Design a binder for this molecule. Structure first.
Ligand SMILES: NC(=O)c1ccc[n+]([C@@H]2O[C@H](COP(=O)([O-])OP(=O)(O)OC[C@H]3O[C@@H](n4cnc5c(N)ncnc54)[C@H](O)[C@@H]3O)[C@@H](O)[C@H]2O)c1
Ligand SMILES: NC(=O)c1ccc[n+]([C@@H]2O[C@H](COP(=O)([O-])OP(=O)(O)OC[C@H]3O[C@@H](n4cnc5c(N)ncnc54)[C@H](O)[C@@H]3O)[C@@H](O)[C@H]2O)c1
Ligand SMILES: CC(C)[C@H](N)C(=O)O
Ligand SMILES: CC(C)[C@H](N)C(=O)O
Ligand code: NA
Ligand code: NA
Lengths: 516, 516
């Protein structure tokens, strides 16, 4: 297979009339389709259930974006049977054939990109550019993994020769596994976690997050149209603690690919270490969990550039990113100039229904709103509230951009992942103390430094202990291929997505010697 | 660093007068030192304890071959402090400097190979060639990992460029971990599991098996002379379920590298999946466990070649190998010709004190003797005893080469790892049924096929589901570099030793972007 070198899918900014027109039409058609029902997808067919999952518009939660079927244990069992049956033959497809199937799925997704973006707008309250970045990242995962998988093809392993023998080592896929996905990047992360394993010959049962079931179904429409053989990919919208846990704990699930909260990731990793009755392997579990990500700014930085990057990092998609800047660590000389600029920029941010393309749409659900507002109340007794801290008026789950300052490094709001538009500003003496504070959390996902001092940058390169570190730019929006994504510590297992190494996680190696 | 391309250390056959003379000298030196006490090695110094571990000669168990100190929880804590203190600077050594240190250790080990082999003979009952293969493999791990580590050096990761930015991804070591080692290859596996992680910048607390504490101490003499910085490698002989479990469960242990029984591997993997109080990472655990390994012979095979390979595979080091052929699966046409040849060959095998270079020495301990004899009793109830099945005269734990025939595929002796000189012979209709029987165990470590039929060999290449498969040769003695070693299913986590991939298991990746 020979294709053009990988390039990232451009993120639409909607600055041309042509792009606005296309997006307006896409939003109109998605809105016109509110209330549609999407079944499960098991063994190559759409399968309905009596029970359903309801997906609300967080900008106007009286509105039902759509419903899906709901998978329980019986549907999990049907999906397992379909996936294992498919694995038997899918594993034997030449890699080039599997990679071409991914490339077809990528082409179909690209052709439906405005529709998928519009679905994210309505279903999870992304503004237009956040929706565009999500979809472009999904396309990037497909394009990237399609190509990366060829690097593992038979027989890929470099071995030392031996006289009178052929020695051949090669990779094989593991089997049928479960993918359990978050609501915050429900096209990008959902797609990536599915297609990586599938590319190299595994089969997958995919469990979308409850708040993002409709867009998960549209991804499955694409998979079905592309023509993945029956059983290779299966779609099981349902309750995480029910069908999700059932699959995690099952003796016949080979691997678990999870992205989500630390709380859930911990349970999954523990469960994966147990031998379920009748289980005949050691389960692999990849868990990519939260962060409490900091940007450090020292007195040498471009303060205007820093303030802009902090505001993008903290408030992009309402701070509902594992990569979001939730801590701003300012050295003494940076404190006043940077905080003043951040406050000035943040107070200008618009908040409203996502379809209007505001700076911030709503948070995703009533439960998320409750948790964020609760953390705001906690924060009021830990640090100094200097901006926002309020729910805004309206049916949708609108929360104002919020800033606390003089926050103690050990405060709950400086340690725990809030996952909302809440920035905690921490004042430190110097760059050495900035690094100490940056590192002193249980997490290690993303981080940033704004500084012109080469020695501070290079020190952070060595010692700011996060998996994804950025200098003089935003700490969100890691690009597939460019920035292998994944963290340290309680940010997860360091499964680097959008990197060659990712696919090795879903392979095992055989070594076969023939003595002639 | 530029060194000669990797080659495997030649295994001494002792066919020359000089080699025999050298072995006799080494045996004499080692036995003159049977009085020796070997302390713990913690933070660059030998540290003694009140309590001790005693090591016996399994060929003459009234003879003590040495004693060592005995690590408890306090010594585990001391080793942890030392290993984490050392990690802070050892991680920052240029890879070339760490690799040179391993190369020095390999040179020192090679200079002491006869002494090490003689220690294996007396301490764990290896005959001369089994001892030589063990030491040569340890040397190989050091030479191979020294070189392989350079493939990961800063900045090793292939990433996609982005305009106006430097994007740099690179590997870093994980931290301090525990290595828990078996008695059956107590130079090779002990050395490999330590030096792989250490090569790329980790530090290690090593817990040798109780039956092989003395030879483990001698490996540490080599590490000390090579000049590993204090705390980089630590030696903690002690009780598995005490000090071993304490380290496995510890919140400050970053990774576990284990080779041993399934029973213990299951406990370790389960424990590793738990977040210990105060733990701030997801532990990595690599567990390489047992096998129930089969050789298939069909009616097209060279029956004499097959019989020789089977006897080597089944009874080499008394069958106390995770790779040992414990099942012999014969198609109808192969059954009589191969079984008659195997019986003729096996009945000629000598058994006695290991230092006399018999075909078989003793099993390693009174406990192993009890286990093997108990399985022989079970076997008498499940199949037909046709050879051996008896303890042999003398204080040493001598057990005759044993063959059961007409063994049902689901018999305990056809399913459970006996780890002694006990071969179970299974008659099957044809090659398809042979593969079915081969695959139907909880294990998947090694396997073999004797056959001249190309289609049967290539069918097995695709479908005989073991990590290390061998055609028309013995299924034991995997060579570093040549045959990446590690299995499927309950044979462990497929951490392929003696392969480039091994070192990646002890690394995490950081991605650092600078926007100019
Ligand atoms: N590290 C990363 O790459 C990354 C990326 C995106 C999001 N996240 C994390 O995701 C979190 C927000 O996502 P979320 O709210 O969907 O997370 P969540 O943990 O609440 O749920 C994630 C998924 O797990 C399922 N689930 C819930 N309980 C389960 C259980 N006991 N067993 C099996 N499955 C279960 C849910 O139904 C959902 O599909 C944040 O913490 C964020 O940091 C991390
Ligand atoms: N897969 C492989 O590469 C491979 C290679 C060699 C040996 N083995 C296996 O090794 C086994 C024989 O070795 P063994 O008898 O030394 O194995 P074992 O499991 O009894 O002990 C192995 C090591 O673990 C320690 N240990 C025992 N209980 C422990 C506990 N609960 N927690 C932590 N550590 C504990 C022991 O003290 C020893 O150091 C066989 O099953 C064989 O198949 C596997
Ligand atoms: C998907 C998400 C984690 C995105 N790649 C980011 O870094 O913000
Ligand atoms: C050390 C041991 C596992 C050896 N390499 C073998 O295959 O027998
Ligand atoms: Na929704
Ligand atoms: Na001994």
């Amino acid at each position: 297979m020979t294709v053009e070198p990988f390039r990232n899918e451009p993120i639409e900014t909607f600055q041309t009339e042509e792009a606005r027109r296309a997006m307006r039409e896409a939003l109109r058609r998605v809105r016109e389709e509110f209330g549609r029902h999407y079944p499960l997808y098991i063994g190559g067919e759409w399968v309905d259930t009596k029970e359903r999952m309801v997906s609300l518009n967080p900008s106007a939660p009286s509105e039902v974006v759509g419903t899906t079927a709901k998978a329980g244990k019986a549907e999990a069992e049907a999906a397992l049977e379909a996936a294992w049956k498919a694995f038997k033959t899918w594993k034997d497809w030449p890699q080039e054939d599997r990679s071409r199937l991914l490339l077809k799925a990528a082409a179909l997704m690209r052709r439906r990109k405005r529709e998928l973006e519009a679905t994210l707008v309505y279903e999870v309250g992304k503004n237009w550019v956040e929706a565009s970045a999500d979809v472009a990242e999904a396309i990037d995962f497909i394009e990237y993994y399609a190509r990366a998988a060829l690097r593992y093809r038979y027989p890929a392993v470099e071995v030392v020769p031996y006289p009178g023998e052929d020695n051949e080592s090669f990779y094989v896929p593991l089997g049928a596994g479960v993918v359990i996905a978050p609501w915050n990047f429900p096209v990008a992360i959902f797609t990536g976690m599915i297609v990586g394993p599938v590319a190299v010959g595994n089969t997958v049962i995919a469990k979308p997050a409850e708040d993002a079931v409709v867009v998960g179904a549209k991804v499955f429409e694409i998979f079905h149209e592309a023509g993945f053989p029956p059983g290779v990919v299966n779609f099981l919208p349902g309750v995480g603690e029910e069908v999700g846990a059932y699959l995690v704990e099952h003796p016949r699930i080979r691997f678990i690919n999870f992205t989500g909260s630390l709380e859930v990731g911990l349970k999954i990793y523990e469960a994966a270490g147990r031998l379920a009755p009748g289980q005949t392997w050691f389960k692999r579990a990849y868990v990519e969990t939260g962060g409490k990500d900091a940007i450090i700014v020292d007195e040498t930085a471009d303060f205007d550039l820093a303030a802009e990057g902090v505001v993008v990092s903290a408030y992009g998609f309402q701070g509902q990113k594992c990569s979001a800047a939730s801590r701003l660590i300012l050295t003494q000389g940076a404190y006043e100039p940077v905080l003043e600029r951040v406050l000035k920029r943040a107070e200008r941010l618009s908040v409203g229904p996502a379809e209007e393309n505001p700076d911030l749409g709503p948070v995703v659900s009533a439960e998320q709103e409750r948790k964020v507002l609760s953390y705001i109340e906690i924060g009021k007794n830990e640090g100094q509230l200097v901006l926002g801290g309020k729910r805004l008026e309206g049916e949708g789950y609108f929360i104002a951009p919020t800033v606390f300052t003089e926050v103690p490094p050990k405060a709950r709001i400086a340690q725990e992942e809030i996952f909302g538009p809440v920035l905690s500003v921490i004042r430190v003496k110097d760059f050495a103390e900035a690094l100490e504070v940056a590192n002193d959390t249980p997490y290690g996902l993303t981080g940033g430094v704004y500084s012109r001092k080469r020695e501070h940058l290079e020190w952070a390169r060595r010692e700011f202990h996060v998996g994804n570190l950025y200098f003089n730019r935003k700490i969100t929006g890691a690009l597939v291929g460019v920035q292998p994504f994944g963290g340290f510590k309680l940010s997860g297992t360091n499964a680097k997505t959008g990197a060659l190494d990712y696919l090795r996680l879903f392979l095992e190696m055989k070594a076969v010697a023939e003595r002639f």
